[PDB]
Design a protein around this nucleic acid. Sequence first.
RNA 1: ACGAGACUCUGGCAUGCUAACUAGUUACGCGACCGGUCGGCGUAACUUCUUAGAGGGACAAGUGGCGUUCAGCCACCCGAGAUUGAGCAAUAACAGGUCUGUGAUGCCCUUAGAUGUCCGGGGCUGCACGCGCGCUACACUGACUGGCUCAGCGUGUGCCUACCCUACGCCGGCAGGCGCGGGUAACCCGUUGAACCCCAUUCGUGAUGGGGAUCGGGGAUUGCAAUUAUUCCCCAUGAACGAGGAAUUCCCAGUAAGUGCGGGUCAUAAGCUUGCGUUGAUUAAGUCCCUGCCCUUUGUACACACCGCCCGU
Lengths: 67, 143, 72, 138, 57, 62, 189
Amino acid sequence: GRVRTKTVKKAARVIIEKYYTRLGNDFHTNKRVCEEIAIIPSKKLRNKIAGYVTHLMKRIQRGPVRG
Amino acid sequence: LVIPEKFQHILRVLNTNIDGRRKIAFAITAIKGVGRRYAHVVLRKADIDLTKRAGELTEDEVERVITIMQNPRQYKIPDWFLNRQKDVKDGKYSQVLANGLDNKLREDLERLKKIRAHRGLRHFWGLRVRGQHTKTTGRRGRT
Amino acid sequence: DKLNNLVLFDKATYDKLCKEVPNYKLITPAVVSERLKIRGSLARAALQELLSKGLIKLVSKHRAQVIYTRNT
Amino acid sequence: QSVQVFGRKKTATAVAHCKRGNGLIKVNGRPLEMIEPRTLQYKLLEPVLLLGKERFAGVDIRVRVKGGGHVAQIYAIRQSISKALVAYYQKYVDEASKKEIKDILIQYDRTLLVADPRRCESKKFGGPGARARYQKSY
Amino acid sequence: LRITTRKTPCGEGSKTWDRFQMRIHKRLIDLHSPSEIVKQITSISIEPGVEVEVTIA
Amino acid sequence: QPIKLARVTKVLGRTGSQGQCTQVRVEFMDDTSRSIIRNVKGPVREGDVLTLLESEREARRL
Amino acid sequence: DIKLFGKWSTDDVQINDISLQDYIAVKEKYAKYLPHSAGRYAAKRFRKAQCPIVERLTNSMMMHGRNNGKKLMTVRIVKHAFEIIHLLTGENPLQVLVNAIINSGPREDSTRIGRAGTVRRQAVDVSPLRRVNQAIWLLCTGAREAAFRNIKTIAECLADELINAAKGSSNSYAIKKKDELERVAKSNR
RNA sequence: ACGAGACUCUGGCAUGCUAACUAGUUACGCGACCGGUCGGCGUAACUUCUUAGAGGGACAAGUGGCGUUCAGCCACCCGAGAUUGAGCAAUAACAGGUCUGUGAUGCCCUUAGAUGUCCGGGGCUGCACGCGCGCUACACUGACUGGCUCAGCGUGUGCCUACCCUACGCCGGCAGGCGCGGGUAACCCGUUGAACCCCAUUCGUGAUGGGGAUCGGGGAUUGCAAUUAUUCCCCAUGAACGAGGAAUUCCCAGUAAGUGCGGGUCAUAAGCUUGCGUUGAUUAAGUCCCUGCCCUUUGUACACACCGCCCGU
């Protein structure tokens, strides 16, 4: 099961709500910017939030995101 | 030495009849004490080729084997390698063939009951010698 | 149960055995034992003896798979 | 020269020292044609004759092995040989034939370059094995 | 160091065990110097739980 | 007992008391116009071809 | 060259099932000099068919709590009877192997079908993968029982069962099992 | 918001990096072949080859088919890795076991007539049988002369603690006597040379060699005290088992399974358990049957909650 929980989804939602311009286009840029401006204790969690940031931004190119 | 036709069914112990189908190093397992590695070692040091079969069992072979099984000191074999070391109730050192003389020694049930020994009473009822504890478990004997 | 097989040396290991194993195309101790009514143990022993005589072609040897084929 | 980059399978590993030598491949003082199981020699000559016995033109490859299990050493000794060939063929000589032989052995199988990450798991208590448990008492 | 201990004080229930593991990490520092200099460096309020064995040869 | 060809085009679902079979849609290659339903037993890949005794069989349908 | 064991040619096989070479393959590039590559196909799904079927054999006559963990013995015992079918039929063992896999491979089986009943069975089509699995299982069951307690050794009981299953002969235990499956498919429509 | 997740050790790529003299392969002869090959190793020695550090890496990130086009699911190329395994695990509760685990404890026998307590000489150490975890097998995919040779967690000389591992000479098949030493430890056994297998030996369908499972003697080391040779072996003893009814444990990847070594108990001790390696599948990537788990709807005269409530003679 690869369902992303509310922690990942909500942190990515807050990040894209807050630092929408600060984001990048590549996932590896996204994890670096996320680790710059977020107290994410561990590498795995910051990776997961970064990945959902990439997917949410991919969803941005075609329309709004509800949250 | 080598001869195609010497196959006989019976070896002489006390004029009784035995089996003679087994091969060499295994046809002399019909004796109570001879067999296992005892027969293997006597044939091994007998200075003969062991590829021979039951049919090539010569009378000279049997005679030499009988002589070697009479006394172990043919190749300086100690008595404990036989099933009977210094005997009980007599000061001998050898195993006796046939029946009625060796099996007389094995009956060991009354005299130990005279001294109220546990070994004699245990062998009196046919119980376990290795010491198998008996509480309820066991699937042999009555079913 | 009951062990009773041929242990006698007679006209069964040389005749009808040395005259029917060479003429067949597959030769195995089990095959020789089954097709020629002979004992598999003595089949192995005689096959080793005739290999020492040198009248077969050996591919490989094993405890249960000794591979022979006709050579002469 | 030491262009060795592991080459592994299970807990056993091989290091394929390579140099400009005679074209004879050695495995800790014994030729690859003679290994203790006497059964996996074809598994060892597979890479060389798959890519071509003509490739070795004066290259001395000594592989030193260490680990548990003979067959576990194999699939890594040959992996070490393939790694040493890759390192030699990447250091100076071209890549077109390198990519050709790489495609050929990659379609042949995958355990010539990339190691198997598998390993023996621990055993969990309350059972005879890691996943097997004792019989239920009625 | 592994110590696998049954959890229930009296044998009952499922066969359950704790696995207490003791990790002991050991470094060596061998320096070319008289031990008096190393002892001068030593008085630095060494961390508790770190034990020192002195080897001079 | 005529035998023709049939190849999978749609895995409709899993059937059976304990997941025994796959209700799958199969087309006949010799006709490439008919779709029938079969409770095929075993792992089935979308596009496999099998020789069959039956060309009209149907099973429990829902 | 990619000949099996370096002695049995691999550029001669003909499955003759129109489209089944993706589920029975000995020509495929995964087919190697030896049938030993350690278990890596069983992890995922539809990857089992990518196995070189020689490996599936050497692991299917590899069972019964007395053989598990003895795979080198299985590879020796398949070299045995490969070089024996090389002489018994005078042809490449791969041809008789594909004949056996194309005939012994079942088509119709009978299974319980329904959500509310338990009275009878219903005919079902056995997919190629399951058909080769159960055909090799019947072959190995016969080869075990044909040399079990018997004077006949391995590589000949297996050999006999393979040859009399490859030609379609019903004398084979595997072919009689196939006939039994077909008849129980007839008797449970 | 707690729980799940997240967390942490990690299994798995460090070819990049701090870096070993308790780690290790290659610049010249040590006993051999006109250039190749040694764990008594050659002068010279670089972190690739074992340990243990920091940072990195894997995210359904990339493509394709489905999807209320979403959450997600299924295939594919690269990649070491596209589900590595476990300890933590809720609110709330039990009349489930433990007063025979405890110097944590409640009227009765116990008020010194003290269910072991100083010393210590028997006791859960019994025989007719019912599917209680498991044990070696029924054989030729094999026990078997022996050839070759590959292991990983560990455990290890010490407070009323001899006894722990354990490199040779002599002897002794079997255990063991004295010594020069090796070990607080990757320095010592150790390169756990090991052990399963690598099939050259009688073996052929049996009572002999599958099956020591059923006899009496003897050397003897830790043990004042081996009486049911309890435990260290040598000879003889082949009973039963021809892979076994109905009901029926357990098992998806280095897994099941086969296989030996280690820790626990410990006079030196394992048919048990706990770890470790080694060898190592077709098992299906599904459904809820007949197994439990009570989630939603529903009925209730139950709420001590169906082991409820209750009617009548």
